[model samples]
Target: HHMEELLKELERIREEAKPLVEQRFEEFKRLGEEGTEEDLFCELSFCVLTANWSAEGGIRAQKEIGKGFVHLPLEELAEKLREVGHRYPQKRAEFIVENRKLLGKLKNLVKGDPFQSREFLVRNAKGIGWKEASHFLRNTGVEDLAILDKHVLRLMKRHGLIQEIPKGWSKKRYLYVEEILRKVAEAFGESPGKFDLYLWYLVKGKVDK
Candidate 1:
């Protein structure tokens, strides 16, 4: 099973580089260039932006935020989960900041929910627990939608997981595959959010791998 999946992913990434190459053109375009909104998936966006988030290349380094956002520092992002009432007023603060610089100055932005904070993730996070999350934050909801980082893709390929690559594997096929992997994680009683982080980590030899 994995055998077929792996081979196909490899072939698609290398041989079927058309989509990816076109994707790169669009990314630059988004920043302002040529390609139109070809619609890049989030995790696939991750592969394009960063070799791998969990890799030695700190997540922030790979991020494409507009600069000085809450995500710049890991702690700020985690502020909401520091305690149970973070989403409230009392926990918010007594004194406040003045400008964007101050907003950028806060010291404890946490990275606990990188994937969930995403717009798409906010939708998908339901039902599933926190462990089995995937970096597929961008190009999700499509069939055959496996996490395409080096670890997920490369490992699946290496282990002989996916062989065929399905003829004309559409976005729908991508999502189906993603759903299966999510099922795989759930069957093991995994943490949807953390599992995603862990697997990506496991793949890049960053932490979990």
Candidate 2:
């Protein structure tokens, strides 16, 4: 079956990139474990900006703004975003400012299983859906949830891990696909976080930011 073949492929790909992925996660883990509030908030801001936008742009924006995200006035932040070419500068700027108040609390909130953490973000963090929430988690070295974006879902269908990508992912559909990824992680004897890196490497040609 394709499952077996895909398992082997995932394994091979993972081994080839094991050192690189491991190093990347170590950096992400350190950021979550000991990064300053500004650092963490910047990552959250990056994830928020990534919604309906490109990751490269998000990353560049994060670097260009740096401490500005924490200190600049809302209007300034929006202008900075616009200068950096953000597609929805004002909206994302609003989200970052609103969520800034919650930054100190997120270290504690991000504890617990991936599902619980993701739920916390979805409920509390403005502009964060399952996909963006998962992106924040993964970058911060919490990767238990599937970050089911277009790339991963497209690959899943090709590999027969899912039936089809839904028009809009209801909660039930999100959990269902998450379980499939969980089992895939199990079959590969890796955490969902680790497996996801390999999946990204296969589909996006790089581990995500």
Candidate 3:
């Protein structure tokens, strides 16, 4: 329902945005074709994980990753793996790291068990809040999964789209939320993953100003 309206808003915004999206994709494709995917992945990792840190800090982390400064690259994944005996710990990071070293047929350790992948992401919460991390873990490929903090939630409510206490929202709630968004994606002829970027761009200037 709300997501459908979100698409309407995006469609209205597109005369000014379509070209920008095209440019972004073209650049993305060019870089990928040129074997700069590691650079791109590093950039995304920093953006996704740096949370409250300055953009510079996130970017710095990515650079360090590209240059081999971080040993286990899943954001505290190495530390979490080493902490397997602790009660507070979940063993996702350990599972990934250990299985990743084995004789490989297909090394997507997370694929055999997605809930386990979800757990890996949840355990790594630090400066980042818990819920945002959980949502992302549920859909790791959803590049533009925006954190539903006060500002965005306010936007949603004011627009009469979604209203609720905003606590303990199950993974099911998010997937339902996402399906509505993806339907909008179908209308605008944009993939939901890309729309996630557009919606996030709506809130990102806050980070800058």
Looking at candidate 3, the ten consecutive residues that score lowest on lDDT are 101-110
Give TM-scores for every candidate, taking all chains together and pairing residue i with residue i. 0.34, 0.90, 0.49
Model 1: CA > 4 A from native: 1-48, 51-55, 58-146, 164-169, 201-205
State the lDDT of candidate 3 residue by residue for 32-145, as single tens digits: 344232343333344344443444444444444443322465446544423322222224333333433322311242233534543444444332233444333223343333
Instruction: Estimate, for each residue in 1-209, the C-alpha lDDT of model 2 and write its tens digit.
Output: 37788787777787677887898899889988987777878888898998878778998998899988888889999999999999789998999989888767767655657678888888889989888888888888886777788877877787888888865666777888988888988888878777778877776567656
Full-model lDDT for every candidate: 0.33, 0.82, 0.43
Better of 1 and 2 by TM-score: 2
The order by descending lDDT is: 2, 3, 1
Q: What is the lDDT of candidate 1?
A: 0.33
Measured with C-alpha atoms, the lDDT of residue 176 in candidate 2 is 89
Runs with alpha carbons beyond 4 Å of true place in candidate 2: none
